[model samples]
Target: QGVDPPPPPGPPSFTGTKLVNDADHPWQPLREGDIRGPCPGLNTLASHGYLPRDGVATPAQIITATQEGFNFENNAAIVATYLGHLLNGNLVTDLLSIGGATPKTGPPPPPPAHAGGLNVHGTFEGDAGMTRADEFFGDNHSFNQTLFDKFVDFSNRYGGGFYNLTVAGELRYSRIQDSIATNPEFQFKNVRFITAYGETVFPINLFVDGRVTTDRKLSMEDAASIFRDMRFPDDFHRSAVPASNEGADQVLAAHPWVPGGNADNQVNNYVEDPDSADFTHLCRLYEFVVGSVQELYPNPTGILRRNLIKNLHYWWTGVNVAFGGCDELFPYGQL
Candidate 1:
């Protein structure tokens, strides 16, 4: 039920812009049984062999893969990867499926301890995805062509036929509104609110060729290759610098959304869920996670308990919540 804490993964020796050369990490079409989920970035990484082709990897491997393959910013990579692992990953073996539930993550933990995969809703993946539909409409995984077309329209409309931060902000807001009007079960609060915005910036930051011009505008062809096909363009390069959701704030500010969900089972019944977290309340989000995880694994002994504490510690340490870190919660007691 337990195991020693694996060291948190770090950025590779060289993080500067460089070829994510096809010679070393050739793009392979997904064979049957190969899994991919909502994350186009992870999907592209898996298809290109940066992540395991089977789509299962340890949290360390995921952090390293994203950073090395995409030149993802260090602390941001740690925060996102560890949060996913803690919420949806298997702490026992340190393995996580980028897609849906798989036997590869080892045996199940107990009821309510459904440590499945990133595909599980409300953990990391959530409603109002730029390309994917709300879970309320079903089929939250897989690329939705109509939604993607909307993305393209936004890019052309706002970015002069390219995808940039401005387009990202507009598209993000529009997608949220679409969910509100159409999906009766729309929910966006806490983690979902954060990830929705981060993901909105991810493509603009990570999908473009590293050597792109000062504009850094992602072309439609390249965007299609990464988002729809889940493969890099021929001889593509990672970002010119270590990039994370650096533009997320701009995206958020464009329309300044508050955390909320639908109160009724009917559409357009959105209600605000307050005091949760945003750029303004990171520590509040940290405290919320501690409480959520405590509910998930209420009682534990030996290995389960230790790994939970370790993962939680790593998350808090990596996030390093602002205004001095949040009061460390002892859900499983102090270590």
Candidate 2:
């Protein structure tokens, strides 16, 4: 998280230079120039299509887009407000709505030449209390889970053809004793947490690797289960205390690789290795399984794989330092 304020007049690409009075308060006009501050988090979101393009789009518009396009429904308001929270580092849900504004008794005035998008302003509270290890890991894991669920829901609502790739980076916790003890509570305390943040495209290519074949064929529940199973191998459970030397072996026999392990070794021998080694195995497995599932449930009217690839580029790339040094140690790529 940085301190680059959102560009003035809001996002230039989405919210063009146009302003009007607040719908609830005609007396209080909402001028495009009225916005004079910085909000990097909000701007980042807008640039990524998480928020609206129109500078004047309202919270309702954000809700609609999330519900219809992004597949976010239950917590639309929370999501909108969360955008604001990320911006200023504090919760500001109330600032978005037209409180106390009543509908006119007479015929309404023609819609304004332009609608005003939500105007959120605030400081970067990136290093907030959510910094504790337990709190941070718990929060991150929860957020990722929510994102996974949303991805599944969206894929279910719209066809699986549409997907998103988001890049996120931030500070977090580490497993080293000195590191863990220094900042024992939050994930953000460790430097490794920052590297932990990276790009992970959703809807998984299930198609490329053959997990899925047709756009309209994948089901949400199955997709979610697949990701859930991958993310939390020991059913997402954590041990209360570090296992003793001898007991550690036993505990690891049950839940190895959750914290630290060899990546290449873990992925190559996926079936035999503990689930924690390579998270990507889950994605690879997804593609393989989806391919089989599609063949099993072939749709007569379904489009061919080539046709779907033409519409969307389905590839991803990023640096995983975890794999950098280990490549030499583990040269064998697995099945």
Best by lDDT: 1
Alpha carbon lDDT of each predicted model: 0.83, 0.24
Residue-level lDDT of model 1, residues 1-335, one tens digit each, is: 54586767766788777888568898888887788888888888999899999898887888888987899877787788878888888888788888889888888886687778888887568898877877777788888999989989999899999999999999999988998998888888888888788888887788888888477788889888888888888888888788888788889989988999888788899999887687788887788877878778888777888888888888877778322567777778776
User: Per-residue alpha-carbon lDDT of model 2 for 174-206, expressed as tens digits?
Assistant: 122222343323222111211122111212222
Candidate 1 global TM-score: 0.96
lDDT of 2 at 197: 24
| Steric clashes per prediction | 1, 27
> TM-scores of the models, in the given order?
0.96, 0.21
Candidate 1 segments whose C-alpha is farther than 4 A from its true place: 1-3, 321-324
